[PDB]
PDB file of C-alpha atoms in Angstrom:
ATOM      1  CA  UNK M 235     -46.264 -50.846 -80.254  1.00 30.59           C
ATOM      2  CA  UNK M 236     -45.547 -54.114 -82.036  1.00 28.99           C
ATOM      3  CA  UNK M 237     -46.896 -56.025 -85.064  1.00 27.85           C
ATOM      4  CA  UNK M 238     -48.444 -52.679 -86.439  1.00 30.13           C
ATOM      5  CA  UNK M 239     -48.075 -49.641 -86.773  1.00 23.96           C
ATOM      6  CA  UNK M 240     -45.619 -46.889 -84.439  1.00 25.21           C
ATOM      7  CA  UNK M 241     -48.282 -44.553 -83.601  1.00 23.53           C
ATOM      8  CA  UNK M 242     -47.054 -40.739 -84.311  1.00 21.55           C
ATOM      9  CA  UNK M 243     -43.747 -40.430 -84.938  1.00 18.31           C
ATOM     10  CA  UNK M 244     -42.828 -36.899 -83.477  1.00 18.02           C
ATOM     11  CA  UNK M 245     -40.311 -36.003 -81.133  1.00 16.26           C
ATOM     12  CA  UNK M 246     -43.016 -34.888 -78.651  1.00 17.90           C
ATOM     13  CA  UNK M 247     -45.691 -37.998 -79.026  1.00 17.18           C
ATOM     14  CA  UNK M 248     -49.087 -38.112 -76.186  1.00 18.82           C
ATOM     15  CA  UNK M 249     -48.373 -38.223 -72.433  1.00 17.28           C
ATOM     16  CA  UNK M 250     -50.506 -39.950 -70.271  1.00 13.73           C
ATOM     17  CA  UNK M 251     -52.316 -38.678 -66.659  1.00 16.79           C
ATOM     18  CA  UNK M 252     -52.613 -40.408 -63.866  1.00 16.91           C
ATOM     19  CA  UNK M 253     -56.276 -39.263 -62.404  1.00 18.46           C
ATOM     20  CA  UNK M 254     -57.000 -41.106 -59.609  1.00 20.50           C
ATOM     21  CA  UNK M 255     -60.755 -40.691 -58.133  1.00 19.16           C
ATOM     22  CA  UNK M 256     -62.149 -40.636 -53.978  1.00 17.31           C
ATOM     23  CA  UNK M 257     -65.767 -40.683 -52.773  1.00 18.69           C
ATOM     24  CA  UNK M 258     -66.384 -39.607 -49.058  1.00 18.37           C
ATOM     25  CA  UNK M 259     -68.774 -42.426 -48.560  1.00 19.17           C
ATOM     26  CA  UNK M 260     -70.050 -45.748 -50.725  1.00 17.91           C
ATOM     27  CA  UNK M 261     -72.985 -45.687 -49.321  1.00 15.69           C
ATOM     28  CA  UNK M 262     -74.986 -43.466 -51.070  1.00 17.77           C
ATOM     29  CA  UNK M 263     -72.043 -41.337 -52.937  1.00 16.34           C
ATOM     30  CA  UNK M 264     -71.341 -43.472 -55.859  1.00 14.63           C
ATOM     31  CA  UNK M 265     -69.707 -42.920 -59.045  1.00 16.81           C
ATOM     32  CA  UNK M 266     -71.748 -42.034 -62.077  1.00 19.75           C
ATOM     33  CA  UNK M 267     -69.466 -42.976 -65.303  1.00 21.73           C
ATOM     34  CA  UNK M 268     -69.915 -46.070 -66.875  1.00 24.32           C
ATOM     35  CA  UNK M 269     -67.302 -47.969 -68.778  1.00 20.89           C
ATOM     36  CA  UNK M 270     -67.627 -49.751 -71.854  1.00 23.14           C
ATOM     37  CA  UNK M 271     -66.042 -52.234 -73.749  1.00 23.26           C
ATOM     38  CA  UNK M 272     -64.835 -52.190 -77.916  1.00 29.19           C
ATOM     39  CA  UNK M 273     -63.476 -55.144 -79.208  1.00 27.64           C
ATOM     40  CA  UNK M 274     -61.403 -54.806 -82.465  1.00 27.87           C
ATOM     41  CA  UNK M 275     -58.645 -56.744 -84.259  1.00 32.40           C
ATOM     42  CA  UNK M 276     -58.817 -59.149 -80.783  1.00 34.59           C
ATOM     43  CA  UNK M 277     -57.936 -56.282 -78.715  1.00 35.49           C
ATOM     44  CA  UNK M 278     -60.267 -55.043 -76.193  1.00 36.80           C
ATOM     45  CA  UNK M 279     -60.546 -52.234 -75.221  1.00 35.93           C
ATOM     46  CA  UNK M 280     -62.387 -49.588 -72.605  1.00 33.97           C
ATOM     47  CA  UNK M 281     -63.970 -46.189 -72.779  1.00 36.56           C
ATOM     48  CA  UNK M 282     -65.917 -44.525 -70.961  1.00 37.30           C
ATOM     49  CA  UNK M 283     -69.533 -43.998 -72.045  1.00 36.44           C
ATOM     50  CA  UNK M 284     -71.068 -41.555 -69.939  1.00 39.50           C
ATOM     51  CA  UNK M 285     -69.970 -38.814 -67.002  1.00 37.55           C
ATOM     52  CA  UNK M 286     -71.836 -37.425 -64.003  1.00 39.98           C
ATOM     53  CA  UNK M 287     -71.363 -33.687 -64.172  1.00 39.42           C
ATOM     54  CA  UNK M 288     -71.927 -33.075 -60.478  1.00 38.00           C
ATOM     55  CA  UNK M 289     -69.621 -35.972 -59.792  1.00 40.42           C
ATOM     56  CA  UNK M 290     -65.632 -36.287 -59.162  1.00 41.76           C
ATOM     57  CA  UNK M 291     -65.043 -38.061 -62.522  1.00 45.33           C
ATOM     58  CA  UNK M 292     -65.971 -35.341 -63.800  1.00 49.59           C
ATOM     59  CA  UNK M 293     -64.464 -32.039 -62.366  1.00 49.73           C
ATOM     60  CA  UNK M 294     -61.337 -34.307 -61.946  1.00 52.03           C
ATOM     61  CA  UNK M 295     -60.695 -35.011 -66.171  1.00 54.42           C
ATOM     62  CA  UNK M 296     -62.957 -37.673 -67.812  1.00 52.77           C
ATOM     63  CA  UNK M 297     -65.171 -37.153 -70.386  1.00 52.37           C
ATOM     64  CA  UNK M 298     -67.879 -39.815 -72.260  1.00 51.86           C
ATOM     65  CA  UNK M 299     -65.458 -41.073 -74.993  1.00 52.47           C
ATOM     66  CA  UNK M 300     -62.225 -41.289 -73.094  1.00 49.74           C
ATOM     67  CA  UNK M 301     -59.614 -44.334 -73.599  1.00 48.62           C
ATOM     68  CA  UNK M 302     -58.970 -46.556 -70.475  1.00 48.03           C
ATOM     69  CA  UNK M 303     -55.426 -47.732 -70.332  1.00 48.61           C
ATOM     70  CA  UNK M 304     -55.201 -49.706 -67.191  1.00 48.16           C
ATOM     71  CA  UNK M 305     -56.892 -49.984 -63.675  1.00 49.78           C
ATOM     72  CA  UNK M 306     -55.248 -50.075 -60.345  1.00 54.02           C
ATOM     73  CA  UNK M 307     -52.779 -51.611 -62.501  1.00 55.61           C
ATOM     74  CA  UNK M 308     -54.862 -54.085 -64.179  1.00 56.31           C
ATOM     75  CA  UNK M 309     -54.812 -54.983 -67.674  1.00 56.10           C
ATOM     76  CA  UNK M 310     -58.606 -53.304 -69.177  1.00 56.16           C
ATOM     77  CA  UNK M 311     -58.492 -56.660 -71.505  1.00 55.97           C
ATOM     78  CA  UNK M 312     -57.563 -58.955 -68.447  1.00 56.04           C
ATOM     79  CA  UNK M 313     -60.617 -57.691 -66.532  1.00 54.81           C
ATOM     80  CA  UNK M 314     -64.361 -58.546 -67.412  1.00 54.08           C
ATOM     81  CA  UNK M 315     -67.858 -57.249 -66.423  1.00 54.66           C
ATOM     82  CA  UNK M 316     -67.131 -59.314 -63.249  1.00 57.32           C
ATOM     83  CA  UNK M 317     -63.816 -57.302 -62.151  1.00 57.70           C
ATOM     84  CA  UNK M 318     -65.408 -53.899 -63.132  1.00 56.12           C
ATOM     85  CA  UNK M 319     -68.268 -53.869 -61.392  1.00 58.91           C
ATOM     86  CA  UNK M 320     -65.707 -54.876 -58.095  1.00 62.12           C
ATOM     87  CA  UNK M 321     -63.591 -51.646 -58.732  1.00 63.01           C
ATOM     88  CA  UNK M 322     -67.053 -49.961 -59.494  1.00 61.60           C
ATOM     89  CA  UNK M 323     -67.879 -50.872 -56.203  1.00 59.91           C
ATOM     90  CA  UNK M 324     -64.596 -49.328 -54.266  1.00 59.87           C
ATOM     91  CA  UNK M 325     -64.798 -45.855 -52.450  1.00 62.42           C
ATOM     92  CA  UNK M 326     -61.283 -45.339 -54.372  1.00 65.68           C
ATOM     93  CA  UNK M 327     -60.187 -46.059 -57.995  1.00 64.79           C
ATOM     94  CA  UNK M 328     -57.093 -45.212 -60.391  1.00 67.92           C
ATOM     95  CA  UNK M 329     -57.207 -44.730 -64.149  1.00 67.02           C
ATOM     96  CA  UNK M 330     -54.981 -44.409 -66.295  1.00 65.20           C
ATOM     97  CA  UNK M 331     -55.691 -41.795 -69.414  1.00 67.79           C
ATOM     98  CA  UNK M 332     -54.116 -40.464 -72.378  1.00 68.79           C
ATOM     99  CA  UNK M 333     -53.746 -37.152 -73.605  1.00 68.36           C
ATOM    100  CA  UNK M 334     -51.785 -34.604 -75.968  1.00 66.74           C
ATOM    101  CA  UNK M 335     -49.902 -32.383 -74.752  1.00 65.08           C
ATOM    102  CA  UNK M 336     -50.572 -28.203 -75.705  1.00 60.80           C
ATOM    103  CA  UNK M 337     -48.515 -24.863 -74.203  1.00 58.12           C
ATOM    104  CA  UNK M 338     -51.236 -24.384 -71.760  1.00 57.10           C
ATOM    105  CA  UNK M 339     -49.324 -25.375 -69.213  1.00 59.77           C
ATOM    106  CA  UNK M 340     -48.847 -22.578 -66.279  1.00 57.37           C
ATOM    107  CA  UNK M 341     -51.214 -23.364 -62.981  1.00 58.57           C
ATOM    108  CA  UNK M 342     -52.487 -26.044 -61.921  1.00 55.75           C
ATOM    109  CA  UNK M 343     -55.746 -26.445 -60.153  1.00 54.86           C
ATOM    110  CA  UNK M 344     -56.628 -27.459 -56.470  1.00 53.93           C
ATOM    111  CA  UNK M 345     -56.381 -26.022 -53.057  1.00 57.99           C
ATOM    112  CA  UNK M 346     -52.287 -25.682 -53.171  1.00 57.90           C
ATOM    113  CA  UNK M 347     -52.021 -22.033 -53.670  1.00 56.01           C
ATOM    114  CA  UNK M 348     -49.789 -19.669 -52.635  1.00 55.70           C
TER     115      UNK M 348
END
């Protein structure tokens, strides 16, 4: 980034994953992560702390102690318990995780098959 240090310098550094989540009704299906907030050096930060197994968050790729980039395209550090809760409360939501990348790469999973 800037004014620190360049993260790992290798010619293959992290990629990130788009995992975007989609309830059938908000009504009574509701999420079951919960996101919380580190402050350090001034920067804030979010992660989540826990993960319904029987839930989409879940199955789709989060896991309690993952590292929220951004939100529906919305700075984590711009929005507060107030603007959380709102996307907490939406039938549809889009984080934005980072990950390493490995040679498992092959099939991917999901109904399109054959």
């Amino acid at each position: 980034g800037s004014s620190g240090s360049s993260g790992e310098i290798e010619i293959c550094p992290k990629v990130t994953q788009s995992i975007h989540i989609e309830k059938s009704d908000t009504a009574a299906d509701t999420y079951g992560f919960s996101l919380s907030s580190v402050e350090e050096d001034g920067i804030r930060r979010l992660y989540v702390n826990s993960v319904k197994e029987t839930g989409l968050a879940s199955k789709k790729g989060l896991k309690a102690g993952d590292e929220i980039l951004e939100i529906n395209n919305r700075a984590a550090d711009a929005l507060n318990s107030s603007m959380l809760k709102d996307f907490l409360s939406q039938p549809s939501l889009g984080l934005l995780v980072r990950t390493y990348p490995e040679l498992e790469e092959g099939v991917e999973s999901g109904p399109s098959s054959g």
